[PDB]
Amino acid sequence: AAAAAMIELDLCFGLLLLILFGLLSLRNGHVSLAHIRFICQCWLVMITPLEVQDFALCILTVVLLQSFHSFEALLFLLLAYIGQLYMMHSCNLVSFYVCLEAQTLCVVVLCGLLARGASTSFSVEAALKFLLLSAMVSGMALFWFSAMYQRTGSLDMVGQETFWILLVMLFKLGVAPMHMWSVDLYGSIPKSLLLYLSTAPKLSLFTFWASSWHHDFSVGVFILFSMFIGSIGAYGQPALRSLFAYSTINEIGLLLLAVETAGFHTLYQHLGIYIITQLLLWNLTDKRLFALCAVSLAGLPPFAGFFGKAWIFWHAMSVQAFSLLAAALFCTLLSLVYYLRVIRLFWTAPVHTAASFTGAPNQTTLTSACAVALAFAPVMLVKPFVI
Amino acid sequence: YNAWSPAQRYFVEGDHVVTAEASRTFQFTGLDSGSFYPYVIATVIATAISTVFIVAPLVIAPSRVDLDKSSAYSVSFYLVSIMYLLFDIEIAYLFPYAMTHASLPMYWTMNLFLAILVAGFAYEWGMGALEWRE
Amino acid sequence: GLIRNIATFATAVVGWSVGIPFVVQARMNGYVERNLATYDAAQRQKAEEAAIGG
Amino acid sequence: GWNALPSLVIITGIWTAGLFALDKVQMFRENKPAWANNKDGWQKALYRRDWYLQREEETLAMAK
Amino acid sequence: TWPEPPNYYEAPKHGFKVTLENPTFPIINPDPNITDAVTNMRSENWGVVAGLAGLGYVAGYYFGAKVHWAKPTALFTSIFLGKSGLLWGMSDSAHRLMGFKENSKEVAANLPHVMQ
Amino acid sequence: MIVASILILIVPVLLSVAMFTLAERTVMASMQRRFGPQVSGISGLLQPFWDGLKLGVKEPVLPDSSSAGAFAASPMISFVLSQVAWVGICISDASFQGLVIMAISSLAVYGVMLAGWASNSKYAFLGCLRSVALMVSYELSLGAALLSIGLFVTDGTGMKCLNFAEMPTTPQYAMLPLCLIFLVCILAETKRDPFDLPGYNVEYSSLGFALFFIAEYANMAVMSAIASIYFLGGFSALKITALFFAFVWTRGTLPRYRYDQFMRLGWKAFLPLTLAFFALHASVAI
Amino acid sequence: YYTEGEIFGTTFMYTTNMMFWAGIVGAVAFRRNLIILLLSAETVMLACNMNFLFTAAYLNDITGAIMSITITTIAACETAIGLALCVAYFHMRSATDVEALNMLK
Amino acid sequence: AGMGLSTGTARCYDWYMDYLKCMDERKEPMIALRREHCLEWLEDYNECLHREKERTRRQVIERERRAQLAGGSKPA
Amino acid sequence: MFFENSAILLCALLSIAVGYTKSPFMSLMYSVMLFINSSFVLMMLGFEFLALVNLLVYVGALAVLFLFVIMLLEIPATELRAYSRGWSTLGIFVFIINGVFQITPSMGPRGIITGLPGAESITNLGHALYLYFADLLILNSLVLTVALFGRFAIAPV
Ligand SMILES: CCCCCCCCCCCCCCCCCC(=O)O[C@@H](COC(=O)CCCCCCCCCCCCCCC)COP(=O)(O)OC[C@H](O)CO
Ligand SMILES: COC1=C(OC)C(=O)C(C/C=C(\C)CC/C=C(\C)CC/C=C(\C)CC/C=C(\C)CCC=C(C)C)=C(C)C1=O
């Protein structure tokens, strides 16, 4: 009986109808597609199950779709969402491989498609490098899956070959020293895909890790590499895109410290606060709120980034992971300097914000002003909330 | 290939079977059912024949050196090649369906597969990508 | 030249077809030797545990 | 026309004689007029068992 | 060693998603068809289908009016949300018929000769 | 015995290719109210043999600006693939024989593209891509036709296959439009009329050129045997001659398409028709 | 000490291991173009596909064949997209680079 | 995922099911603690898979056969 | 079994040869030889249909796209530092260590395995693909859809 699979049939039927509707709308010469975007958001809601993580991903992708305008980009983001959703439910390396590869192909094509102006060739260059680096990591995953399949005779993810699969997962999160594909991507690709790349796949992969993964090894050297390299790199790079790429490497090192000491509640709290800050960061038009992102990414006390860092520090001290904790505290002391550089650049400066001329007047002030109210979330964060 | 174990020889003992297998004639109704071995021999023999065709006019033909005798007298192909690649993969997927006595849920799964195929194809038709004006 | 390249390819194919099976044979011989050492050590441990284990 | 008839007759005769000769040669190789049939795993198992048991019958015959 | 003689004409009866439950309610029909699923559907399911269709019509009219294409957008969005709701309702009815959900209303209506 | 069987197969293939190219000349002449070759031997029966021997003692032109290996390899690859495909027709018992021949004929594209890469002509590079585009475009309709054919091919034990000896010995009346599409696809693969616009062998002389034409006519005979097996209830000498006569008859009476015209035909007419027929036959076969 | 089947199996596994590392390393080591890098990625995929098919025969199991079909699909899609991007980048940067498709120079 | 390539199931599927049944019937709060009590079934499943111990026995018999022919070459 | 083992070992030689040569055309020719030889290797294991899929997809379709791209984009620069710059000794050392000596093999502690031919059943494959792995089949279709749309969007205008 197939009566337990109506959501899958609904997914496929919705894709079949959406392609035909997008074709009919384009035969009329419509230069805007807000109706297509609303149908895409409805389809996103209709295929998502009733778990916390699934709906967090769903609501995140509904918010992200407001920064994309063409039909093909919307289709690629939907088919990347299918991989992102179904990776959280993957209990093998077969589905794991297919979901990861679908996401990689969608990201590569979007990086090629959306570039404009003088930065087109730089974006295509960085997309090619990302594709080549992704191909060999995919080959490593397939090779060691074949080794595990031959040794165990089954699809269980146990044994020594899980160390290389773990390295595949660490590549997909931009963990140093395999971090330079993300550093290349941050310097050229436009802001909407940078917003997409810093939020949704990290959530999808960490939920797969929380749900169906065990390894008998450690990730401590990659924690050290990510934290020290990210902090020193963001201290040393004057371009703002490289600053935010290296600060992202530092944040993924903190999330790996939360993974390594168990306690995924602190991981989920810090990831949620980080995702809301990212949603504020890449949609800013008034540059004074760039200082709020700075004080809430430096871990300064009353804002929500402090709470996200401080439960990670608390659980690390609870299980006595002293050396990694000391390295994390040193890199936190270093991170403050370049977040202060951000504050010097964009707060202690005269205010200029250009008006719109061709309509759409400051079109994402709702989301940015809503996400700035991360100064009111700390009242709920101090309680036993995320567990 | 020859069998290397008593279990592979149906537990027949002796030395007559080993020599008889190593010096057997090729037989589709003996030990070589569905074998694809004549395809290799055909390649070797035809390569020999075409090499003899290539070499022979270098001996039995006249030749004169001249500097003028040894001289010369779009993106649609990208579309065709990539579309052919994807459609060939899809037909290769459809081939295990046609080689089975399929039940009704197999039929409806296959039709969902074909529907996704033809939906992408019809989108590229409607956007004017199969009109080869350029 | 064409004849030189065809001769070099034929030489490389024949040399690869004769040389690599010796590498594989040496590797398999090393694995057999280490496995026999492991079997003998296991038998020694079993005899020791029978001796002081009753 | 009448000039096109000899080549068209010769093509048929060539293919008839060649297929007859190839049939006789492959019939001498295989000794049964169903060698080209499709065979699944059960039929392959049956033929391989038959071959090995024929070899065993030959081995046991040269002992009496 | 000797394999089983294959049955080429018999395909396994298998759906790709397996429920891993036994039903905890009486089983009326272990395998209902689409007619069986629609003819034993409750009124709340039809209500949520009509609510989804109405919301789809109104929202499609709003979004399709920005490109002056409001009526076909409203019709398409209504059908899209309505078929989502209809698949949900048919699945709920089939699960009640198979015994995986509460079916006290369905047992007293689907067995005319096995009423009491 | 396998080498003997293969050589006994190879002999009538080459003899038949010579007689096909003569019969094409003479039938094309008879439609045009003339005679065709009659002088060269009695009833012109030595003309292909003297063409072959004339090309044998012809000077081989090796251009000293090309890559000699690929230039030599292109007609050898074409000829070898034609002979191997004939062996797959007659000296095989494989389960997926039609898939084997489809795979071999998909390899035949390489001789055209190696000739296009090797020779340093401006328009050889221009025409090789067009010829490859035509062959590539019609291969998909051939594959979907094979999908429709294989839905009804079952052997005695109940297994579905593409084995030629298990095909029925009656004409497939239910698949007449698919048979017509198959025949026009054969015409498109062999670059005949009405698809003969693209040539690629403009720099080849003597026996390399002879290898090109022997490969072309042998591939035509392969596709004729395949069509007679799939649709006409078996492989026979009369069916080979009748289908060859039909191809020459079409070449006598029709003009050719432009490049974009047969591209639109193959990508907007033949592929959707074969896929729709596959869906209908799958619905019937349940 | 060992049989002909064991020689055949160990030779297969040694061959595929050297194939995998050849595809991973060699075109980068010889400082080749992006087109040859994509070809070597196809070599990596072929090594994994052969390993899966060997294991599927070895265990009498279906999962290797499913993985084989999936690997062919994903590898061809990624390769086609990469070649399209290579052509686009070459046409964007050939006016000032000449050797634009070689990033290992 | 345990389906056979030419048969209904794989050749060592039932050994795997024996091991998983043992793991199912234990009550320890950790998988690593439950694994210590089902090591015999895991060993039999590994012996089904690769036959390392049968190969080891054959290697030992071959070592003794090579020893009884070099050190012992006794003529009649 | 000399020719079968030699045909198995030839695949690694062709894998090295793809990157070793300086001509891109010759690299593609080596790849075509490798895929044909590997399709014949897969048929030693008993796979008839999947070997034909290997041939039909990789040699028939993908290598044609490779040869079109190479022939459209490669003006001869083999002298232009493709010969004059050589190769990387560190990369060659990595290849030797990992693929010749094989310090981290896929079989791990095992060093000997018995190769066993299979008997491919396409009825079993059809049953598996269209009943047991049907969700993976549909997601493969979605990946092919991504490829088709993405190529047609990325085609240089
Ligand atoms: C414009 C869109 C409108 C859509 C809504 C209206 C259209 C109707 C919806 C389609 C039909 C109803 C939904 C499916 C009904 C299944 C219930 C059932 O049992 O029906 C048959 C079930 O057969 C099917 O048709 C099964 C459909 C299989 C679909 C397989 C694909 C599922 C989706 C996979 C997607 C993968 C996920 C992608 C993302 C990772 C057989 O009925 P029976 O068991 O009573 O008959 C017995 C007889 O002997 C035959 O079994
Ligand atoms: C309008 O279409 C046509 C063309 O344009 C496409 C042509 O170009 C040609 C001319 C080209 C020809 C005939 C070349 C192709 C055929 C050949 C080489 C014949 C092959 C025959 C063989 C191998 C058998 C002959 C050899 C024998 C009998 C061996 C002899 C040995 C001894 C005596 C010891 C023709 C006739 C033609 O109609």
Swiss-Prot record, chain A:
Transmembrane segments annotated in the record for this chain: 6-26, 38-58, 59-79, 93-113, 128-148, 163-183, 193-213, 217-237, 244-264, 265-285, 289-309, 310-330
Listed GO MF terms: NADH dehydrogenase (ubiquinone) activity
EC class (word): translocase
Reaction catalysis annotation: a ubiquinone + NADH + 5 H(+)(in) = a ubiquinol + NAD(+) + 4 H(+)(out)
Disulphide bond pairs: none
Keyword annotations: Electron transport, Membrane, Mitochondrion, Mitochondrion inner membrane, NAD, Respiratory chain, Translocase, Transmembrane, Transmembrane helix, Transport, Ubiquinone
Top-level taxon in the UniProt lineage: Eukaryota
Function: Core subunit of the mitochondrial membrane respiratory chain NADH dehydrogenase (Complex I) that is believed to belong to the minimal assembly required for catalysis. Complex I functions in the transfer of electrons from NADH to the respiratory chain. The immediate electron acceptor for the enzyme is believed to be ubiquinone.
Name of this chain's protein: NADH-ubiquinone oxidoreductase chain 2
Native source organism of the sequence: Chlamydomonas reinhardtii
Lineage, highest ranks first: Eukaryota, Viridiplantae, Chlorophyta, core chlorophytes, Chlorophyceae
Curated annotation (Swiss-Prot), chain F:
Topological category with respect to the lipid bilayer: Multi-pass membrane protein
EC class: translocase
UniProt GO cellular component terms: mitochondrial inner membrane
Keyword Membrane on entry: yes
Purpose: Core subunit of the mitochondrial membrane respiratory chain NADH dehydrogenase (Complex I) that is believed to belong to the minimal assembly required for catalysis. Complex I functions in the transfer of electrons from NADH to the respiratory chain. The immediate electron acceptor for the enzyme is believed to be ubiquinone.
Entry similarity comment: Belongs to the complex I subunit 1 family.
Name of this protein: NADH-ubiquinone oxidoreductase chain 1
Organism: Chlamydomonas reinhardtii
Protein's gene: ND1
Swiss-Prot record, chain I:
Keyword NAD: yes
Keywords noted in UniProt: Electron transport, Membrane, Mitochondrion, NAD, Respiratory chain, Translocase, Transmembrane, Transmembrane helix, Transport, Ubiquinone
Main location group: mitochondrion
Top enzyme class: translocase
One Gene Ontology cellular component: mitochondrial membrane
Family indicated by similarity: Belongs to the complex I subunit 6 family.
Protein name: NADH-ubiquinone oxidoreductase chain 6
